[PDB]
Amino acid sequence: ALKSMTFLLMLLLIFFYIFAVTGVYFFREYSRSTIEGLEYNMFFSDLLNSLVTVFILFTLDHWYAVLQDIWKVPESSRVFSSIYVILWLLLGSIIFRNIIVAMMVTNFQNIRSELSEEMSHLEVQYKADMFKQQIIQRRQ
Amino acid sequence: MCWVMPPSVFVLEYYLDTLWKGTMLFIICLVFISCNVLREVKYQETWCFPAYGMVIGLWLMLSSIPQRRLVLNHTRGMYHFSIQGRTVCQGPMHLVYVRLALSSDAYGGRFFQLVLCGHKLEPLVLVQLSERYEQMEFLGRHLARKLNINYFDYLASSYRHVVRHWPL
Amino acid sequence: ECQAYFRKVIKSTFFQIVMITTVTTNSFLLVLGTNYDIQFEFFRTFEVSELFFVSVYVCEFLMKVYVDPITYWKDGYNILDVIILIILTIPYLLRKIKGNHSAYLHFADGIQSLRILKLISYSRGIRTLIIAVGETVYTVASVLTLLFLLMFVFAILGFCLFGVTDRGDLENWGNLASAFFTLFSLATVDGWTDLQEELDKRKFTVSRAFTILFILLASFIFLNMFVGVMIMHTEDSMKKFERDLTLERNLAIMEEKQIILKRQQEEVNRLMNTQKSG
Amino acid sequence: DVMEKKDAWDVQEFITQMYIKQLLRHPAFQLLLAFLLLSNAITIALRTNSYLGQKHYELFSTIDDIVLTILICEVLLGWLNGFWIFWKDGWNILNFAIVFILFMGFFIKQLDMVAITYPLRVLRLVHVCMAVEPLARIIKVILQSMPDLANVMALILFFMLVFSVFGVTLFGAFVPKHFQNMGVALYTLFICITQDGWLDIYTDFQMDEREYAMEVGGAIYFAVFITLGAFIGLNLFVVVVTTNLEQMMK
Amino acid sequence: MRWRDRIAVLCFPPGLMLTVAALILFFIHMGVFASDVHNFCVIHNYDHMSFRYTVVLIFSQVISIGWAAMGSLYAEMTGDKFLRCFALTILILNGAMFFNRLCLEFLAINYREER
Numbered sequence: 001a002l003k004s005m006t007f008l009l010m011l012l013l014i015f016f017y018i019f020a021v022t023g024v025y026f027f028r029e030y031s032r033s034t035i036e037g038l039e040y041n042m043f044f045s046d047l048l049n050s051l052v053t054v055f056i057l058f059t060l061d062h063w064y065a066v067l068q069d070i071w072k073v074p075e076s077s078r079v080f081s082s083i084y085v086i087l088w089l090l091l092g093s094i095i096f097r098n099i100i101v102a103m104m105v106t107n108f109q110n111i112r113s114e115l116s117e118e119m120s121h122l123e124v125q126y127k128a129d130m131f132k133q134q135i136i137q138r139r140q
Numbered sequence: 141m142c143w144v145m146p147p148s149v150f151v152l153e154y155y156l157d158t159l160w161k162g163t164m165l166f167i168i169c170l171v172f173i174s175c176n177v178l179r180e181v182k183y184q185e186t187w188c189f190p191a192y193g194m195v196i197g198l199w200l201m202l203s204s205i206p207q208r209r210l211v212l213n214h215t216r217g218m219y220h221f222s223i224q225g226r227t228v229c230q231g232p233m234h235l236v237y238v239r240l241a242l243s244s245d246a247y248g249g250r251f252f253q254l255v256l257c258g259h260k261l262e263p264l265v266l267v268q269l270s271e272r273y274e275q276m277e278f279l280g281r282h283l284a285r286k287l288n289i290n291y292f293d294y295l296a297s298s299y300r301h302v303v304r305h306w307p308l
Numbered sequence: 309e310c311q312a313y314f315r316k317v318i319k320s321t322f323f324q325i326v327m328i329t330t331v332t333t334n335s336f337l338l339v340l341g342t343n344y345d346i347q348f349e350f351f352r353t354f355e356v357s358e359l360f361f362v363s364v365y366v367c368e369f370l371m372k373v374y375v376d377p378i379t380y381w382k383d384g385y386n387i388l389d390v391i392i393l394i395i396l397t398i399p400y401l402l403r404k405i406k407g408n409h410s411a412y413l414h415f416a417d418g419i420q421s422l423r424i425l426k427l428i429s430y431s432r433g434i435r436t437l438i439i440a441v442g443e444t445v446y447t448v449a450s451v452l453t454l455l456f457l458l459m460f461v462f463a464i465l466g467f468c469l470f471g472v473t474d475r476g477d478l479e480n481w482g483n484l485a486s487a488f489f490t491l492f493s494l495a496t497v498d499g500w501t502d503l504q505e506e507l508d509k510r511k512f513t514v515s516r517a518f519t520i521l522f523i524l525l526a527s528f529i530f531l532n533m534f535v536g537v538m539i540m541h542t543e544d545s546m547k548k549f550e551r552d553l554t555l556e557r558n559l560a561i562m563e564e565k566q567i568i569l570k571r572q573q574e575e576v577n578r579l580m581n582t583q584k585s586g
Numbered sequence: 587d588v589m590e591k592k593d594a595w596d597v598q599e600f601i602t603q604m605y606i607k608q609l610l611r612h613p614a615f616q617l618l619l620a621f622l623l624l625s626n627a628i629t630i631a632l633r634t635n636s637y638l639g640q641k642h643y644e645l646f647s648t649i650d651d652i653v654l655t656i657l658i659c660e661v662l663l664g665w666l667n668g669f670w671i672f673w674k675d676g677w678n679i680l681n682f683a684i685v686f687i688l689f690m691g692f693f694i695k696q697l698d699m700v701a702i703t704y705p706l707r708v709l710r711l712v713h714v715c716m717a718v719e720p721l722a723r724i725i726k727v728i729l730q731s732m733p734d735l736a737n738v739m740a741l742i743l744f745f746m747l748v749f750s751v752f753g754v755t756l757f758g759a760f761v762p763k764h765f766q767n768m769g770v771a772l773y774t775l776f777i778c779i780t781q782d783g784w785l786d787i788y789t790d791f792q793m794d795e796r797e798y799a800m801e802v803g804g805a806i807y808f809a810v811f812i813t814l815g816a817f818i819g820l821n822l823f824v825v826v827v828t829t830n831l832e833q834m835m836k
Numbered sequence: 837m838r839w840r841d842r843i844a845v846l847c848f849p850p851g852l853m854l855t856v857a858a859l860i861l862f863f864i865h866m867g868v869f870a871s872d873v874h875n876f877c878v879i880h881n882y883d884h885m886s887f888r889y890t891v892v893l894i895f896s897q898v899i900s901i902g903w904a905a906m907g908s909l910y911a912e913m914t915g916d917k918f919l920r921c922f923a924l925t926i927l928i929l930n931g932a933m934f935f936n937r938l939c940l941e942f943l944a945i946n947y948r949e950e951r
């Protein structure tokens with residue numbers, strides 16, 4: 001199956017790449033904010049930290065708490081940034097989860113299809129062997 | 141009921157069910173008369189709704205009917221439209237048929253009814269069972285064994301329907 | 309006239325190699341641009357490389373400004389790339405030399421990421437995967453609309469249950485946008501515990517029952533319908549593709565067998581003719 | 587066939603044919619109804635704001651009356667073809683109940699409030715939108731899949747009760763206020779079945795005797811039970827979904 | 837046929853009667869409209885003006901309008917111009933009288949009660 005996983009991981013890492021490098025300078029007012037009381041500032045600070053936090057968003061753990069901690073940013077009518085991160089997390093999570101479960105289900109499907117054709121071939125070979133045994137018995 | 145009604149010895153007789161609607165309207169109004177809702181706080185009185193119900197129920201109750209009958213007597217009968225008292229419609233064949241009709245909703249569910257067609261005749265609506273097609277022309281052949289006239293199907297002639305009398 | 313030679317040139321691998329090299333250097337420019345030093349200092353290389361990249365992209369749009377937009381108006385990948393070129397060219401035309409009224413910067417790394425998307429527009433294997441998964445757009449749109457309708461229903465229900473009374477629970481089931489975001493959180497698994505502790509203190513005992521009913525409807529239905537729909541859509545998409553590939557292989561096999569049979573018949577006829585004439 | 591002269595019942599069937607020809611097959615009337623319903627949906631989205639409602643309350647009342655009267659007109663036209671077929675339908679019962687509740691709360695005084703007026707309108711929005719084809723298949727297979735969901739739900743709840751006996755043996759009056767009350771205990775177990783953020787609960791029963799105590803035992807029993815039940819539930823959900831969806835694909 | 841017998845019994849011919857019912861609805865609603873106008877203009881006896889029966893006669897108005905329409909539709913197929921002219925004239929007069937009473941009631945709005 002991981003042999004069959006030839007292009008899905010490449011698309012996964014490239015969607016990760018584009019969305020993470022896009023979302024570095026989107027909540028740029030969060031880590032680079034002078035609010036004394038904050039605890040998730042290091043999430044969006046560095047590029048590798050951006051990779052870590054968008055992988056966290058991909059795993060979808062405490063996205064509500066994360067968004068409430070980014071709600072401490074001055075609310076600029078949430079017109080582009082919140083919808084961008086929400087669409088990124090939902091689209092990436094559901095699309096890639098569905099695509100990988102679909103690929104592994106298709107792997108099981110073709111494994112069983114090859115098995116089915118193989119005992120089908122074995123059965124027709126056995127029937128032909130029985131017919132040729134009857135032919136040999138008659139020819140004697 | 142399957143071997144009682146299709147034999148239909150000689151004449152058949154028929155009635156309408158509008159008397160049920162009239163009786164139900166009378167019952168509903170008589171419920172509405174005593175101790176209805178007290179909506180004087182609504183600055184209105186709703187006695188005219190059961191009054192209009194009484195007008196409708198009295199008019200529907202006036203639709204009396206003695207036993208709509210024909211000359212479906214198992215002979216050379218004329219199929220003359222017969223009513224106790226007055227008689228209206230008379231015709232030499234070619235008019236009394238039995239036709240399957242179809243109705244559809246927005247979804248596409250099909251409902252099948254049957255009508256004894258003619259000049260102001262009565263239908264042959266079956267008892268509240270139309271989801272599947274079942275047998276079609278078996279009851280049609282029973283009607284044929286009665287007094288064979290027609291058994292029409294939907295749409296044009298095409299196939300799948302039988303005729304017995306024609307005027308050319 | 310010269311359209312045949314121009315299309316022959318555009319079919320050559322060297323132009324595509326130059327294009328891929330330019331946009332990979334653009335990807336490296338974005339990699340160095342998320343840093344702060346090379347963002348504005350030691351940046352003359354950034355300037356000249358960005359000028360080269362915008363020149364190359366303008367040239368690509370000049371290739372795609374032909375009559376071929378009669379096919380770049382109905383197709384798949386093609387409309388995507390020309391629209392990507394348009395939404396690339398317009399903003400940095402109003403950003404690099406702006407001189408205008410605008411709020412702030414939020415589309416530099418975004419524009420460079422669109423350029424990276426144009427880099428990934430190649431790789432025909434990804435194109436075949438995109439073709440194999442592109443018939444699910446209508447299905448995912450329909451499930452998204454169903455999600456939006458259910459979200460609207462429980463949005464008005466939550467506002468009328470906890471925001472209308474105005475005895476607390478503000479900015480959770482209060483203001484419409486925050487209400488929608490809290491519903492999206494509650495339809496997932498995240499944030500349900502803290503929200504539950506928030507809502508039970510507002511003198512509403514049935515609120516817990518309503519929220520658990522909402523979870524057991526929305527979360528399960530959305531997740532499991534999505535995974536089942538995509539699983540069997542992908543399965544039925546690949547089944548016909550594999551069957552067609554095996555049919556093509558079988559047709560080639562029978563054609564080769566027919567060629568062999570015809571060659572054997574020709575050899576037998578030639579041998580018989582030489583035996584007769586000899 | 588030839589049909590030289592029509593009769594009364596052919597006339598009646600023809601009249602019903604033109605009656606079902608309009609508003610049931612014509613896309614124009616359904617498009618107008620959908621446009622009106624989307625407009626009042628937009629006005630619904632324009633609520634939760636009194637700054638807009640101060641110049642809009644009278645218009646909101648008028649459009650409420652307009653949508654109510656077109657709804658009851660549609661219901662009356664559906665009843666015209668026959669009360670039996672409208673009563674004996676899989677979905678028209680829902681629209682009839684919606685309009686009945688809305689009109690009963692409108693004309694007669696009612697404590698129904700916006701919490702009834704608006705959800706009923708968006709239910710009608712859904713019932714209109716599924717009639718237009720490209721979500722009808724998905725809603726059809728959702729309602730086909732739910733009876734097979736029911737047995738999985740029942741089995742899950744029964745197993746969770748027969749393990750909640752083992753739960754409530756170590757529950758109540760100790761690590762309390764979420765393991766007590768025997769139904770709040772059940773729903774906290776359900777919260778942990780949903781499998782998100784139980785580390786608050788993990789710290790709740792933490793430090794029983796600070797090394798093992800029952801801090802090991804109850805936690806490990808409940809944790810392996812939680813992970814097994816969560817896997818079984820999530821699987822059974824997705825497999826029932828794909829099983830009933832294969833019925834669609836046939 | 838024997839209109840005679842048609843008018844005889846058991847019920848009656850098609851529709852018709854259902855069309856002439858709209859006529860007698862028009863008669864009674866015209867009488868009520870005349871009483872309303874008469875009490876509005878000169879006598880000024882708002883105590884006994886029809887402020888009290890407001891929605892029920894509007895419902896009577898609308899069922900009469902629908903009845904005249906349905907009668908016109910159910911009587912048009914006779915192929916005779918006189919019946920169609922009869923039904924269409926009744927529909928037109930009923931619609932005009934409905935709109936007239938709607939305008940009258942919308943005008944006299946400050947005279948009933950207040951909510």
Ligand SMILES: CC(C)CCC[C@@H](C)[C@H]1CC[C@H]2[C@@H]3CC=C4C[C@@H](O)CC[C@]4(C)[C@H]3CC[C@]12C
Nearest residue numbers: 188191192195864868883884885886889893896
């Ligand atoms: C029931 C169906 C046929 C509709 C007919 C409605 C009739 C019964 C209604 C509508 C108009 C009504 C009248 C309108 C005006 C007057 C004068 C007023 O000071 C007292 C009520 C009174 C005397 C009403 C009596 C009942 C009435 C005649």
